[PDB]
Design a binder for this molecule. Structure first.
Ligand SMILES: *[C@@H]1O[C@H](CO)[C@@H](O)[C@H](O)[C@H]1O
Ligand SMILES: *[C@@H]1O[C@@H](C)[C@@H](O)[C@@H](O)[C@@H]1O
Ligand SMILES: [Ca+2]
Ligand SMILES: [Ca+2]
Ligand SMILES: [Ca+2]
Ligand SMILES: [Ca+2]
Ligand SMILES: [Ca+2]
Ligand SMILES: [Ca+2]
Ligand SMILES: [Cl-]
Ligand SMILES: [Cl-]
Ligand SMILES: [Mg+2]
Ligand SMILES: [Mg+2]
Ligand SMILES: [Mg+2]
Ligand code: NA
Lengths: 142, 254, 198
């Protein structure tokens, strides 16, 4: 940080380092001590990892040392919020939310089906018995 | 069953007791009003094929009550691939001569589709196993039906957690392990053929058959249950077949 | 296929990502996570990434202990090849985030230094909880500070997000803060905050 008329005063962290970028030695001359200088420099020279805007889908970025953290809106996940929860409606994902049987339909929505003795409700996923004693239910409880 | 509980009467309403010449033989699972699934190995010593009975609605072997229903076994269907005295393809499909009547104490367990069973039911950690087998390894059998909750392992984990035994059977794609390695809880010989039943979103399904193990509740060992998902198409075809004249049928597999 | 290896948990303020090797060549991965007694939940279905964000599953109970496993499936499509992760307990093992000094104020002959609330991935009612919301009394903040004209360093510790420290009049002081969970024996501290001075 050199312009000769601006170099006339004793050291200043505000002047040298916060209004201007300073080199490690300039900061060392201000702090003097090795550990004080190290503590400052490690963060000051680290850079803002959020500057590249890595968080997608309206997520929020927080800077860390050589790293960031993305905080996602509810419908998203991933390191960078890149995964759309709404696009994971498939049979290997918790049975596609189907109560009983699940059928994948590529390009289109998966469908849900039922075992014999049951029929699929209007809700498209839930199953109801069509017989008095459907398989796999314990009536003595109910 | 070692380390289980008594199954409250009616709470295991698909459990089957199989008898030969009136003597306890094995367990089994009712899967609709005519068909029962059990283990092939249960049949290795049978000479009197026309004297097999399935009892539904059983609980206490020392008292009859009005919920028990007995039906003669008309057919026992085993994969041709099964070899008597060995462990692989340990399944039998049993046709009852007359249907049982479904009641609050007699209900079938659902046989699931293969893909649902492989992709969803296989990852439900706990399932129930039941029967009137031995209460301790080399011990006396139970008079009241017993039930145990067991967690399932993928076979890689089961191999990695099992004590090495010289010349022991392979755990094949047609099997899976479930239970506990610490000597506390397992199915046992007299439970063979009974259900390993899995609860998923309000319905119970047949996922396994009590099949084999190193002793019962041996430290360093899990129980092994026939992987019923591998047989769904084989069972569904055979349940559509016409009966044949003799009791035993060895049917091709796949 | 080849099995995943070097499975590693990367987790800061509960943002938790499982990482593994190798880069896929004609294979894809799916991850499953469970607690010891619970069912396995699949995540990151057929991904070609060598990472999987598990934050949303682990924030449901940060004090639980989770096991993950990564399955390898051959391109185009028995039990698959797989490798298990280390166990992970997020409350015990998540990294504490780098903190930020929010403000400092001269009140009396003393200076208040306030640490910005550290935000975590644990949600409550449409809000992200802070580290202090999650950890309560298990979390402290520590302040490293110095008088510029002096040699040597001072430290203060707080059960809140604020420090009230004595200062010599007309002197400049610099400060830096760490989050700390003193009950831990490993990963007990965050990295230091940027230094801020009067
Ligand atoms: C800048 O943005 C990229 C991704 O877009 C990310 O890799 C960096 O880590 C971030 O700082
Ligand atoms: C940062 O947090 C994420 C979750 C979003 O709410 C953003 O709008 C905010 O800036
Ligand atoms: Ca300047
Ligand atoms: Ca300058
Ligand atoms: Ca200087
Ligand atoms: Ca200089
Ligand atoms: Ca940074
Ligand atoms: Ca009885
Ligand atoms: Cl009959
Ligand atoms: Cl905080
Ligand atoms: Mg200025
Ligand atoms: Mg300068
Ligand atoms: Mg110098
Ligand atoms: Na055991």
């Amino acid at each position: 940080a050199n312009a000769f008329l601006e170099e006339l005063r004793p050291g200043s962290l505000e002047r040298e380092c916060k209004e201007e970028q300073c080199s490690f030695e300039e900061a060392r001359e201000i702090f003097k001590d090795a550990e004080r200088t190290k503590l400052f420099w490690i963060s000051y020279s680290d850079g803002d990892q959020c500057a590249s805007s890595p968080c997608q889908n309206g997520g929020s970025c927080k800077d860390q040392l050589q790293s960031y953290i993305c905080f996602c809106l509810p419908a998203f996940e991933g390191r960078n919020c890149e995964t759309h929860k709404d696009d994971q409606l498939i049979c290997v994902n918790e049975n596609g939310g189907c109560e009983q049987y699940c059928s994948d339909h590529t390009g289109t929505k998966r469908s849900c089906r039922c075992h014999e003795g049951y029929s699929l409700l209007a809700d498209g996923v839930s199953c109801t018995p069509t017989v008095e004693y459907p398989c796999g239910k314990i009536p003595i409880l109910e | 069953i070692v380390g289980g509980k008594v199954c409250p009467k009616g709470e295991c309403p698909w459990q089957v007791l199989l008898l030969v010449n009136g003597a306890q033989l094995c367990g089994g699972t009712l899967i609709n009003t005519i068909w029962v699934v059990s283990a092939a190995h249960c049949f290795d010593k049978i000479k009197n094929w026309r004297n097999l009975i399935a009892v539904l609605g059983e609980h206490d072997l020392s008292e009859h009550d009005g919920d028990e229903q007995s039906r003669r076994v008309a057919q026992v269907i085993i994969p041709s691939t099964y070899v008597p005295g060995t462990t692989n393809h340990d399944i039998a499909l049993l046709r009852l001569h007359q249907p049982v009547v479904l009641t609050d104490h007699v209900v079938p367990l659902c046989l699931p589709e293969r893909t649902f069973s492989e992709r969803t039911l296989a990852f439900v950690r706990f399932s129930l196993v039941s029967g009137w087998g031995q209460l301790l390894d080399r011990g006396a059998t139970a008079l009241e039906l017993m039930v145990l909750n067991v967690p399932r392992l993928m076979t890689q984990d089961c191999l990695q957690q099992s004590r090495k035994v010289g010349d022991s059977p392979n755990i094949t794609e047609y099997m899976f392990c479930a239970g506990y390695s610490d000597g506390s809880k397992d199915s046992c010989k007299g439970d063979s053929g009974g259900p390993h039943a899995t609860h998923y979103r309000g319905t119970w399904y047949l996922t396994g058959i009590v099949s084999w193990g190193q002793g019962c509740a041996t430290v360093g060992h899990f129980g092994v249950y026939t992987r019923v998902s591998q047989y769904i198409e084989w069972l569904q075809k055979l349940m559509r077949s016409e009966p044949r004249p003799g009791v035993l049928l060895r049917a091709p597999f796949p | 296929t080849v099995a995943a290896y070097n499975l590693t948990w990367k987790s800061t303020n509960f943002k938790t990502i499982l990482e593994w090797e190798p880069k896929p060549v004609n294979q894809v991965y799916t991850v499953q996570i469970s607690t010891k007694s619970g069912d396995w939940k699949s995540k990151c279905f057929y991904t070609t990434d060598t990472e999987c964000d598990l934050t949303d599953e682990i924030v449901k109970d940060v004090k639980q202990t989770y096991l993950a496993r990564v399955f390898s499936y051959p391109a185009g499509n028995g039990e698959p090849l797989y490798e298990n992760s280390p166990e992970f307990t997020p409350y015990l093992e998540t990294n504490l985030g780098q903190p930020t000094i929010q403000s400092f104020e001269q009140v009396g002959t003393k200076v208040n230094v306030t640490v910005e609330d550290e935000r975590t991935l644990v949600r409550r009612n449409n809000t992200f909880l802070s580290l202090r919301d999650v950890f309560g009394k298990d979390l402290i903040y520590t302040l490293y500070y110095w008088k510029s004209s002096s040699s040597g360093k001072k430290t203060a510790k707080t059960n809140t997000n604020e420090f009230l420290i004595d200062v010599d009049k007309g002197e400049n002081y610099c400060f830096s803060v760490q989050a700390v969970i003193p009950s831990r024996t490993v990963n007990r501290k965050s990295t230091d905050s940027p230094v801020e001075c009067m």
